[PDB]
Write a protein that binds this ligand. Structure first.
Ligand SMILES: *[C@@H]1O[C@H](CO)[C@@H](O[C@@H]2O[C@H](CO)[C@@H](O)[C@H](O)[C@H]2NC(C)=O)[C@H](O)[C@H]1NC(C)=O
Ligand SMILES: O=S(=O)([O-])O[C@@H]([C@H](O)[C@@H](O)[C@H](O)CO)[C@H](O)C[S@+]1C[C@@H](O)[C@H](O)[C@H]1CO
Ligand SMILES: *[C@@H]1O[C@H](CO)[C@@H](O)[C@H](O)[C@H]1NC(C)=O
Ligand SMILES: *[C@@H]1O[C@H](CO)[C@@H](O)[C@H](O)[C@H]1NC(C)=O
Length: 863
């Protein structure tokens, strides 16, 4: 056994030979740091009993436990392997107890399969019987992708483990964590996963959400695969330099999907086809959002709103945090400090802005005839709370308002209660979207106001390395009871079920509209319902750097609308850090400046009406808003096809191994390269320039750099932004709200490749109606340039914007002087455009044109 391939047999304590001998493992304390001293022998585990059986979907096998000493308790003697060839690119296998039903995740999107095995498989499955292992190989090159033979299968009631070899160390994903780097290096590292309210800091703890998906780029050809584990129990994932990854969970079943693609993007697409593609956002949610914990008063909030509006900051959304509430209780507002809240909502709406309100799941249980508290009274009438282990008494915990009960969102009746609370509240305060927080669920006491009984749920045989080392820390008792089952099994599904219920509420409160839901806690598939933010970060340079991998990973997880608290939630933000963070933050798919209680103001205009920070923030937000049609089209592709929005360089440039590690730059889709300064004091950044033609976004000048590391000069007022040759970017003149910007003239930026060609597309619908894609009420058009000619082609034509929108400007980068520009509509001229040319920069701008959105055109020129 190569020591890199040793699978640790003593995950639970300091290794000893006595424990090693008792567990029947191998002892060799002579390795390098972190190399396990005690590791599994070659026949710990299961063997296939008798023959495999073909089924319509695939095959089954019966696995029988080989005699072994019971470490983490009640072992499963007879295991059933069920394998389904679900599609040419997706394999599913699950290991269950042949004799007993066990907890299975009741996912809202994924359904059971009742097909026949797919034809033309891109993969092959090999089963070894003595001992059991499962291998999945890529058919084209026989690359072993999944191979459990490196380790045993362990399957006890509260301890399940399976390992797989990996074909490379280009491994991305898992969550929710602060990984600091984007590529997992595969050095010995254990990542615990158990939804927890905790600071995203440098400690690598489990955080708010649970995401078991990873993607592996196999080699420079782009061939990639992914693995998803459908299990909601506390678990950890162990990475080691074999390379290999081990999943170790403390309940449920091992239900695995393996996805193959020809590129990293195809793997994400296959994963999202399974778990659910992300919602198309309201176009206004793409704008800039501003927020803080504790304005304290409506007057204070108004003062902030007003100075940022006075500054002409692009600024669509204002969030109201728990300070709007009457004593931090949901579905109230403070009639003194927030007196006149409804009037302020009208002011926002009149200014073309939106209000997003925070709503917490925990509900104050303080109600009497003297002073009733409606949401509690109504929820109690409907009996929709999470109960204690007795199965009948609502569990009492403590959150913002004091003592609280917790809604059981797994109960469909709970969604009815919740919907009605929102309806009642929306009648008083006409908010536009909902920010659901503290939904891990977060509890200010451990378990309940009376703690947690000692039993195998609260105190299991094995505890993964979750923060604080007890499952019930800062959450509910594990033996609490909900419709879908015990908190031990469904804890990781709380925020997911809450997002589903809040989407259901939206159906009534915002009829036929998308609205906007922002959630803290997530499970696989949450992006179908909600955006995410990366939680309670801190105003440090490390937190700035750590945000980009967090954004990229959530795009892999199908939650493309993701971002951190720009400038940092905890602590007073230094001007220089906030200026850099706003520059980068103009390019997060979810762009929100948010701040914790009591800290110095960090809203952009608070730095001074003529400050470098405000000027730079306005500048780059104006660029963001200019590219909103491009961004919105990226979201359309994420929703319809499963593409990422914020995208690693390697997804586009996988042929170039210099991109495999890059985590300080990222792309919007295929075409826009973002290069922030991320180091204190720096007016430069060490940047990678991929193998493409690149143009400076502002000047349009072609950079000399190609496929090389560069020192990019970025003074205090700059972030790197370059456009990829071969791409056409739709734009729209910016305004301070998207309500207004959407009415503005459109533009095209055509970034020519080495062959003087480029292609692009534009999706356009009404920006807010639900089912616009499903019901085919949209415009989709395609742009292509191949010399001397731009074609605008209409592929879907079932929405016509009433605002007379047209492309009134075409900017061509990397071109020789165009002459005789002519515009044809369905073959007919047209009215001579104006052409301006910069021969030093090789940039042409065509103006005095009017190409109506949704009409086909050819624009031709000579040289
Ligand atoms: C939590 O406990 C309540 C009782 O406090 C349970 O309420 C039951 O709800 C159903 C309505 O679906 C009624 O038919 C029963 O009469 C209720 N019981 C009582 C005693 O009122 C509720 O089911 C419990 N929830 C869970 C997840 O077990
Ligand atoms: O620090 S804290 O006092 O602010 O409480 C944190 C958290 O609870 C923290 O204490 C962790 O335990 C690790 O520090 C809580 O998450 C803040 S919530 C989400 C945020 O975005 C809203 O503005 C806040 C008000 O609704
Ligand atoms: C780890 O946790 C504690 C927070 O309670 C903190 O003081 C320490 O700085 C953290 N370490 C890092 C690297 O974030
Ligand atoms: C920008 O929005 C304002 C509304 O606040 C509107 O009056 C103005 O005309 C818009 N500017 C344009 C057309 O670019």
């Amino acid at each position: 056994v190569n020591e890199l391939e040793r699978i640790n047999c003593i995950p639970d304590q300091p290794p000893t030979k006595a424990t090693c001998d008792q567990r029947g493992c191998c002892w060799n304390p002579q390795g390098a740091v972190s190399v396990p001293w005690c590791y599994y022998s070659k026949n710990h585990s299961y063997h296939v009993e008798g023959n495999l059986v073909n089924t319509n979907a695939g095959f089954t096998a019966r696995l029988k436990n080989l005699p072994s000493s019971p470490v983490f308790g009640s072992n499963v003697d007879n295991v059933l392997l069920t394998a389904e060839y679900q599609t040419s690119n997706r394999f599913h296998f699950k290991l269950t107890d042949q004799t007993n039903n066990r907890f299975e995740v009741p996912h809202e999107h994924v359904q059971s399969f009742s097909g026949n095995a797919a034809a033309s498989l891109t993969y092959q499955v090999e089963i070894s019987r003595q001992p059991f292992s499962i291998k999945v190989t890529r058919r084209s090159n026989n690359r072993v992708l999944f191979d459990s033979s490196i380790g045993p299968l362990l399957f006890a009631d509260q301890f399940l483990q399976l390992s797989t070899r990996l074909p490379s160390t280009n491994v991305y994903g898992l969550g929710e964590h602060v990984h600091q780097q984007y590529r997992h290096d595969m050095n010995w590292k254990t990542w615990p996963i158990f939804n927890r309210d905790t600071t995203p800091n440098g400690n690598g703890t489990n955080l708010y959400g649970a995401q078991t998906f990873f993607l592996c780029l196999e080699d420079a050809s782009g061939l990639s695969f992914g693995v998803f584990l459908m299990n909601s129990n506390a678990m950890e994932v162990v990475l080691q330099p074999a390379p290999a990854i081990t999943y170790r969970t403390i309940g449920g079943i091992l239900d695995f999907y393996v996805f193959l693609g020809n590129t990293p993007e195809q793997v994400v697409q296959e994963y999202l086809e399974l778990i659910g593609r992300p919602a198309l956002p309201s176009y206004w949610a793409l704008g800039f959002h501003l927020s803080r914990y504790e304005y304290g008063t409506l007057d204070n909030m108004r003062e902030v709103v007003e100075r940022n509006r006075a500054a002409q900051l692009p600024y669509d959304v204002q969030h109201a945090d728990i300070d709007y509430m009457d004593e931090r209780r949901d579905f109230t507002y403070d009639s003194v400090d927030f007196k006149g809240f409804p009037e302020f909502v009208n002011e926002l709406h009149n200014n073309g802005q939106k209000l997003v309100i925070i709503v917490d799941p925990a509900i104050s249980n303080n109600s009497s005839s003297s002073k009733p508290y409606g949401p509690y009274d109504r929820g109690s009438d409907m009996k929709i709370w999470v109960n204690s282990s007795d199965g009948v008494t609502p569990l009492i915990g403590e959150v913002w308002p004091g003592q609280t009960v917790f809604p059981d969102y797994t109960n469909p009746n709970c969604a009815v209660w919740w919907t009605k609370e929102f309806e009642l509240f929306h009648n008083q305060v006409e908010f536009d979207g909902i920010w659901i927080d503290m939904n891990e669920v977060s509890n200010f006491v451990d378990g309940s106001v009376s703690g947690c009984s000692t039993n195998n749920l609260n105190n299991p045989p094995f505890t993964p390395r979750i923060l604080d080392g007890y499952l019930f820390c800062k959450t509910l008792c594990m033996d609490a009871v909900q419709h879908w089952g015990k908190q031990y099994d469904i804890h990781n599904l709380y925020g997911y079920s809450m997002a589903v219920a809040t989407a259901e509420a939206a159906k009534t409160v915002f009829p036929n509209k998308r609205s906007f839901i922002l959630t803290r806690s997530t499970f696989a598939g949450s992006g179908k319902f909600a955006a995410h933010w990366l939680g309670d970060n801190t105003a440090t340079w490390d937190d700035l750097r750590w945000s980009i991998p967090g954004v990229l990973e959530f795009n892999l997880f199908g939650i493309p609308m993701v971002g951190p608290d720009i400038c940092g939630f905890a602590l007073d933000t230094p001007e220089e850090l906030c200026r850099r963070w706003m520059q980068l933050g103009a390019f997060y798919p979810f762009s929100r400046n948010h701040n914790g209680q009591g800290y110095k103001d960090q809203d952009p205009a608070s730095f001074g009406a003529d400050s470098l920070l405000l000027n730079s923030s306005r500048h780059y937000l104006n660029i963001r808003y200019t590219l909103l049609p491009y961004l919105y089209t990226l979201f359309f592709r994420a929703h319809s096809r499963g593409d990422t929005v914020a995208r690693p360089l390697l997804h586009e440039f996988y042929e170039d191994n210099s991109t495999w590690d890059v985590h300080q730059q990222f792309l919007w889709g295929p075409g826009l390269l973002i290069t922030p300064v991320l180091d204190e004091g720096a007016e430069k950044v060490m940047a990678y320039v991929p193998d493409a033609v690149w143009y400076d976004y502002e000047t349009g000048s072609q950079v000399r750099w190609r496929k090389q590391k560069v020192e990019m000069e970025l003074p205090g007022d700059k972030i790197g932004l370059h456009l990829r040759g071969g791409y056409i970017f739709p734009t729209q003149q910016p305004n301070t709200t998207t309500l207004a910007s959407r009415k503005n003239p459109l533009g095209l930026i055509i970034a020519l490749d080495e062959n003087k060609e480029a292609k692009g597309e534009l999706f356009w619908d009404d920006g807010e109606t639900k089912d616009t894609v499903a019901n085919k009420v949209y415009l989709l058009c395609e742009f292509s340039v191949t010399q001397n000619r731009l074609e605008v082609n209409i592929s879907q034509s079932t929405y016509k914007d009433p605002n007379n929108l047209a492309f009134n400007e075409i900017k061509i980068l990397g071109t020789e002087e165009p002459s005789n520009v002519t515009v044809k509509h369905n073959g007919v001229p047209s009215t001579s455009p104006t052409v301006t040319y910069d021969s030093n920069l090789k940039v042409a701008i065509i103006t005095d044109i009017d190409l109506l959105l949704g009409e086909a055109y050819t624009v031709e020129w000579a040289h």
